[PDB]
Amino acid sequence: FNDNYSSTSTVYATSNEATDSRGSEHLRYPYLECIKIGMSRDYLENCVKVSFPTSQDMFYDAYPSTESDGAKTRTKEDFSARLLAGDYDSLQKLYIDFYLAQTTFDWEIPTRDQIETLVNYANEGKLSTALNQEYITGRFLTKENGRYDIVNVGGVPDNTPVKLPAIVSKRGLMGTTSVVNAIPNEIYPHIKVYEGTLSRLKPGGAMIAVLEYDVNELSKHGYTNLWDVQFKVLVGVPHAETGVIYDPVYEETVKPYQPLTGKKLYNVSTNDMHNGYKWSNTMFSNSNYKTQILLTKGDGSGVKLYSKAYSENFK
Amino acid sequence: FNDNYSSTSTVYATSSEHLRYPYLECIKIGMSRDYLENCVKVSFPTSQDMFYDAYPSTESDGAKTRTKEDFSARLLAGDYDSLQKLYIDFYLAQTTFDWEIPTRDQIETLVNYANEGKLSTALNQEYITGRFLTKENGRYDIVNVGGVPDNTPVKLPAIVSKRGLMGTTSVVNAIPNEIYPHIKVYEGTLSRLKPGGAMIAVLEYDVNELSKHGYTNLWDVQFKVLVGVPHAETGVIYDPVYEETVKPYQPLTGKKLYNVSTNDMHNGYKWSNTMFSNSNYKTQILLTKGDGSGVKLYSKAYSENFK
Amino acid sequence: QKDGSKGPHALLSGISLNWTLTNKVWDVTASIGIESGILPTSGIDSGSLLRNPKSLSFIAFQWCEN
Amino acid sequence: QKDGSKGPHALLSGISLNWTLTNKVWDVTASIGIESGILPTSGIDSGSLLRNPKSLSFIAFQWCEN
């Protein structure tokens, strides 16, 4: 058997956990608890949008007690251990998929867009107390389309332990799309532009380039079918921290037609000819604008692979 | 090994108040976490014992005898009223209050969810084919999924949220019981369905069969005319290319009659310009109560000259 | 899995190897017993059984005796 | 167990016996597939696999043929 082998189990599966809970069942649930750990009544709408602090024993009231007949070993200690060990899958399967408390069902790891909201809510005192402090700075576990990432709030050192202070409602907690507080991990592939009388990024016409990607690092980021691709070009001021042009003044999708050695190559030809020239009429309307190229799967999925935000003539 | 081989599993078997309710139970009987939003939209399978955890036990002081056996007995006996008042009106579980018998539009949705695996296990299987009890405005009907024999026993696998479970209005999976009243068109130099002008007819309904379908005040009426391809199974033009509402003026014997005059020249002729723009189009007439309520009574989707 | 897709390896409960001699041909059948509620309701792999599976390699020994 | 302690015997899903001949030596590899979420994240016994485990005795048959 190879390393992709995986099996079902008795510890993170069903049939073990029974209809029981080590917490108190009452008629003021869960709002009494939300206020009791400091959530303001002005923002009680978030009581069902974000869980109790994973740092406190109350969070684990939802599960059958670890001593009762048939219960899984689930405690705030076992949670933190798996967290710092990097066993994020066991957290999803043992705890997250079976929280199901606070009358909310779509508990998930927060997205990058959701941590951004959590930082704003924490600073504005709209959360529980322990989380109003927690989401100010630190390294936080995020999850976008089944993929784990660590986002940084406040520029903390890279060796700060990963924090997952609370899980959030997948749809109930509204994310913020602007990148301000939670700074992500964008991937930049090593690529060569062949230039010469070929690649061209100068005002007055269409932008064309011909890059070249390496196969071994495409397979590391989930790109083994080297024709299941699509390209995006962005025009605007890139983000000062990550370098991506998240809200470009001009966005354009194009499809490639290339087919060499231990690497494979891909073209790119903007449609700036035989239509509005406006790519160059906006790319070169402001000296701080830059042009960036992004690679996705054919339907826009996959690990987003970014080129540098170039100046004129790929500088 | 023979096919009788079976093993334990990581899945609940089929042999209490807590804080993970009701979503824990939904996953336990096979609802995927990807579609848990339906956990409060559809009840536990009425064929299983868990649905009946909601009621006070049949042995407790003063309690009604509520069991899956007593449920199945009344279901096949046709005592649909006793189910609504004794079980449905007193369920009130899964944090949902508007439990009702599903409509035809809701059974339509339930089959799609069952085929795509969006329900619990017992119901992902249950709603593929069969005959199902439905309820539209206080009226019971039986719908057929898959063209099953008419002697198939009535199934009520689950009750649904009145507003939470979204119905699908297109009729594809659940084939209903549409009513076509015995009616006579008088024709001659009277009724006319030919291109180039207005369509007029004068029908005649029987009184004893009007009283069977909730029509005793025979002036509490209104009419709709449809133009398009009728449904291949029931014959109704559900999404007509041209819809038009008209009101009647008739005043006879042991039956009663009603007219109908499309307005084609006191508006655009376009009824004849679209009814006769495609050879498969037909014209069908529908009878309702004055406000669009009541048992929908349908004429045949007629061809040119009521053919 | 029940939706027809390829899931994780379910847990196992038993393996049966059956063989019968009929006119110069040994007929070998196999069934791998796994946890129920994972396989679809019908098919080759159904209920709790993987019938004559490809996920099995066995060594066949033959000899003659009196 | 993932916490470094020795727990109870986990449930089993498969056993693989693989062998390859290279310069007068048979290289024998084995893997026992067990329920995941019990083994640590890394090591010989990790994820869902006990790699070339000592908790296995197998009989090795050798012969030559044309």
TrEMBL record, chains C, D:
It comes from the Bacteria. This is Toxin-coregulated pilus biosynthesis protein B. It comes from Vibrio cholerae. The gene is tcpB. The chain holds residues 365 to 430 of 430 of the full protein.
